[PDB]
Amino acid sequence: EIGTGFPFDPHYVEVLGERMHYVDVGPRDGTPVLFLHGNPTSSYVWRNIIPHVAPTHRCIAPDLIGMGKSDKPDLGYFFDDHVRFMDAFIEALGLEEVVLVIHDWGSALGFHWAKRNPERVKGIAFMEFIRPIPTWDEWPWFAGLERIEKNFIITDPRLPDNPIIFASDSFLQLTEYSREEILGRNCRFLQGPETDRATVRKIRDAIDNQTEVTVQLINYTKSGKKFWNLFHLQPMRDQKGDVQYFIGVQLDGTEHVRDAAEREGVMLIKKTAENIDEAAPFWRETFQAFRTTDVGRKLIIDQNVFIEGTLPMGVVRPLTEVEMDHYREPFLNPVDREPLWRFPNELPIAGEPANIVALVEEYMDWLHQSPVPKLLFWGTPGVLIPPAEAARLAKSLPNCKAVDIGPGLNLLQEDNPDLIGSEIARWLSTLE
Ligand SMILES: CCCCCCOCCOCCNC(=O)c1ccc(C(=O)O)c(C2=C3C=CC(=[N+]4CC(F)C4)C=C3[Si](C)(C)c3cc(N4CC(F)C4)ccc32)c1
Ligand SMILES: Cc1cc2nc3c(=O)[nH]c(=O)nc-3n(C[C@H](O)[C@H](O)[C@H](O)COP(=O)(O)O)c2cc1C
Ligand SMILES: [Cl-]
C-alpha cells in the first residue's frame, strides 16, 4: 500500500513571533531541497516523496503558518501573510541556494520567492500550481466523482482525438480496464472484430454533428470477453454554448437482453445522462460558494467541508481513515479553520482578486524567461492544471521536462508518489 505513516522527528523555529514546524532529514553539506505544501495539507502530503530524495539531498518541509504543527496566530491568513512567514522561515534556517519542490499554494510561495531571489533557485519541481484561471468553465465540475454509483465517462473533444478524461468506477468494472489504461485514449479501444461498422459510423457522424446518439454495440473487455454495450452519448456546452465535453453513459453486462428490455435500458441511460448534466453546474458551483463570507465560512469553518468533502475529492484513489485523521489533526478545533477558508478566496479565477491575479501573472512572466531547470507533473483530469495547459507549458517554459503521473486531480503525491519521487531524484542528479 501507499504509506500512511509520518516517520519524521519534528523541528521548530521562531518566525515573526510564531513557531513553525518543519521536517529536516537527509545529508547536511549540499544544496537543500525545499518542499512547499498548500491547502488543506501540510508536510504530510510530502511523506512518500522525501524518502526518494533523502539518500542524496537535504529535505526541508515546513508546515505553513496556521497549518500542520505550526502555531496558529490571529491573522487574516492572506497570501501576503504566508509570504512574510515563508520569507522569514527561509532566512531563519540560513538557506542560501535551494531547489524548490512546490504544490498548490506552496507553489505560489515558491514561484513568488524565486522571482525575487532568482540566483538562489537552482531548479524547480512543481505540480498542480497556482496560475491565472480565466474562466470558471476551466474548473472541472467532475473532479472527485469517480465513486459515484453511475457508469459514465467524460471525453474532451478539444484534446486531439477526443480522449477519455474521466471514468467512474462502474466503467472500470464493466470493461475490466484500470483507470490508467483508460484515460487519455479514445473510447474506440473497446471495439473488436465483431463490432458492427455501420453502427460505429452512426456514432462518428453524430459526434461530428455535436449531437446525441444512443446505440448498442459489440465491445470487448481487457480479457477478450465480448459483450453487448448499450450506451448513450451527448454533448455538454460551456457558458458560450460551445461543446466543451461529451458525456457517455453505458449499461452493464453482455446484455443479450438488448431486446424489449432494451427500451427500458435506453430510457435508463438517457435518464442518467440528463441527471448528470443537470447536476454538473452545481458540482462546480461549490468552489464559488466557498468564495463568499456568510455561506462560505459556514461550509468551510462551521461544517469543515474542505477537509471532509473537498480534500478526498482532490485524490482519485480513496484516502484511508489513517490518512484522513492526519489531515484532520490540525483542524479539530473549528476556530483554527481560517486558512482553509481564506485560501480559496485568494485563488485568481476570472480576474478576482485583482491583486493576486497581477502577482501570479508577474511570476508566470518570470518563469517564461527564466533558464532555471523545471520539472512539471500533471494528471488527468487534474484540477488547477488541465492537461492542455500542461501541454502548453511543456513547450513554453524553457528548460522544462513534463511528466504525466497518470490519473490525478490535485493532490498528485497521493495517487502516484513513487513516480513523482523517483523522477525528482533522477532530475536532481542532472543538476548542479
Ligand atoms: C489549492 C487548490 C485545492 C484543490 C481543491 C481540490 O478540488 C477538488 C474538487 O472540489 C470539490 C468541491 N466540492 C465539494 O467539496 C463538495 C460539494 C458537495 C458535496 C455534497 O455532499 O453535496 C460534497 C460531499 C460532502 C460534503 C460535505 C460533507 N460533510 C460535512 C460533514 F463534516 C460531512 C460530506 C461530504 Si461526502 C463524504 C457525503 C461526498 C461524497 C461524494 N461522493 C463520494 C464520491 F463518490 C463523490 C461527493 C461529494 C461529497 C463535497
Ligand atoms: C462520450 C463518448 C463515449 C463513448 N463510449 C464508447 C464506448 O463505450 N464503446 C465504444 O465502442 N465506443 C464509444 N464511443 C465511440 C468512440 O469514441 C468513437 O467516437 C466511435 O468509434 C466513432 O469514431 P471512429 O469512427 O473515429 O472510431 C464513445 C464516444 C463518446 C463521445
Ligand atoms: Cl484553495
Numbering used by the authors: 3 to 434
How does the study describe this entry?
The crystals formed in space group C121 and contained two assemblies per asymmetric unit. The two psHaloTag1a molecules adopt a near‐identical conformation with a root‐mean‐square deviation (RMSD) of 0.33 Å (for 431 Cα residues). The extended Jα helix is in a folded state in both molecules and consists of about 1/3 HaloTag and 2/3 LOV domain residues. The FMN cofactors, JF635‐HTL fluorophore ligands, and Cl− ions were clearly visible in the electron density. Based on the density, both FMN molecules appear to be unbound to the adjacent C189 residues, and the folded helix of the LOV domain suggests crystallization of the OFF state. JF635‐HTL adopted the same position as analogous fluorophore ligands on HaloTag, and while the electron density around the dyes does not allow for unambiguous identification of the open or closed conformation, the open conformation resulted in the best fit. While we would expect a primarily closed conformation in solution for the OFF state, the observed open form could be explained by the tight crystal packing around the fluorophore, as the surface‐exposed dyes from the two chains face each other in the center of the asymmetric unit. The two performance‐increasing mutations E143W and A285W are in proximity to each other, and A285W to the headgroup of the JF635‐HTL fluorophore. These tryptophane residues could form an extended hydrophobic network together with neighboring hydrophobic residues (I150, L147, and additional residues towards the center of the protein), which could improve the stabilization/interaction of the fluorophore and improve performance. Overall, both the predicted and the crystal structures show that the HaloTag and LOV domains are tightly arranged and connected by a long helix, which ensures efficient propagation of the conformational change to the HaloTag in close proximity to the fluorophore.
